[PDB]
């Protein structure tokens, strides 16, 4: 098929050529001799044309291309925004789970391009390409869902899932043999930090400093609140507030943007910008496992 061929070509173009070999070592769809027939020192057009030749010599399909896309996503895992779904209310099996999920998504409207790829730490990665009742599913607007066996949490990349969100949720909860499924308001791009947060897996004596008690108290409070461990790499925060003025409630809306949050916030108190004890709205980001906040008096 030409569609799968151009899909594989686009995925390869997305892959940096410096690691394409690793991709093959992770893809393993093509024989190692075919890999040896291609040198990676030559031009990008030449290498992609040779890869097209190699995949056309074998039988190119959708499952192998989807697996390649999945493994590319694994190696990058930095180009999408992730949200977290919680299931609630004990026997598991991979094969029957896959069968049930596939059956539900086929029953969704008529068809959908679904691909599975088991990963270490029970990380089943699922690539889903949506399609309507009268069109083949599109491979240019995919979505990714990460499931952990026998766990109450799942991860989803929401690029176009706002079209049909309840369908994916009900399919996931029926496949997970769980009744209640909810979406917590927590959204971020560093997927590994989300993993850590959801599971909680994280001299010149002539100078006479004055107010040194204030400095030692503020540094101690900051250390006790944050800790010596490297804080999870979180990148976006937003609070929507509506509280009485006390100085008709004022409605406020703040967004914190930072390439490395929880560290500038860690340095605010030592820099003297904020008080020694920070407000609970900022000291419970890893504690409350909350990202979007609404508080009222």
């Amino acid at each position: 098929d030409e569609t799968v061929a151009e899909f594989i070509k686009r995925t390869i173009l997305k892959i940096p050529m410096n690691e394409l070999t690793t991709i093959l070592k992770a893809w393993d769809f093509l024989s190692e001799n075919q890999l040896q027939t291609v040198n990676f020192r030559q031009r990008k057009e030449s290498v992609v044309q040779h890869l097209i030749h190699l995949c056309e010599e074998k039988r190119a399909s959708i499952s192998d291309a989807a697996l390649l896309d999945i493994i590319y996503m694994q190696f990058h895992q930095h180009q999408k925004v992730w949200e977290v779904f919680q299931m609630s209310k004990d026997l598991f099996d991979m094969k029957q789970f896959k069968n049930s999920f596939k059956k539900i998504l086929q029953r969704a409207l008529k068809n959908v391009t679904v691909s599975f790829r088991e990963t270490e730490e029970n990380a089943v990665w699922i690539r889903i390409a949506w399609g309507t009742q009268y069109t083949k599913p599109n491979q240019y607007k995919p979505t990714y869902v990460v499931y952990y066996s026998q766990t109450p949490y799942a991860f989803t990349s929401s690029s176009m899932l706002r079209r049909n969100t309840p369908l994916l949720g009900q399919a996931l909860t029926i496949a997970s043999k769980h009744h209640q499924i909810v979406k917590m308001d927590l959204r971020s791009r560093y997927l590994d930090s989300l993993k850590a947060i959801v599971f909680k897996q994280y001299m010149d004596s002539r100078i006479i400093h004055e107010n040194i008690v204030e400095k030692e108290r503020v540094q101690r409070i900051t250390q006790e609140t944050f800790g010596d461990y490297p804080q999870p790499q979180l990148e976006f925060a937003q609070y929507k507030l509506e509280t009485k003025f006390k100085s008709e409630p004022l409605r406020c809306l703040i967004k914190f943007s930072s390439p490395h949050l929880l560290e500038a916030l860690k340095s605010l108190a030592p820099a003297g910008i904020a008080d020694a004890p920070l407000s609970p709205l900022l000291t419970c980001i890893p504690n409350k496992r909350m990202n979007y906040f609404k508080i009222r008096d």
């Binding site: 004022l250 409605r251 406020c252 809306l253 703040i254 914190f256 930072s258 949050l261």
Partner: peptide, 10 residues
């Protein structure tokens, strides 16, 4: 590069 506060009012 550190936090960049954005403050919005209705």
């Amino acid at each position: 590069q550190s936090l960049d506060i954005s403050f919005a009012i209705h």
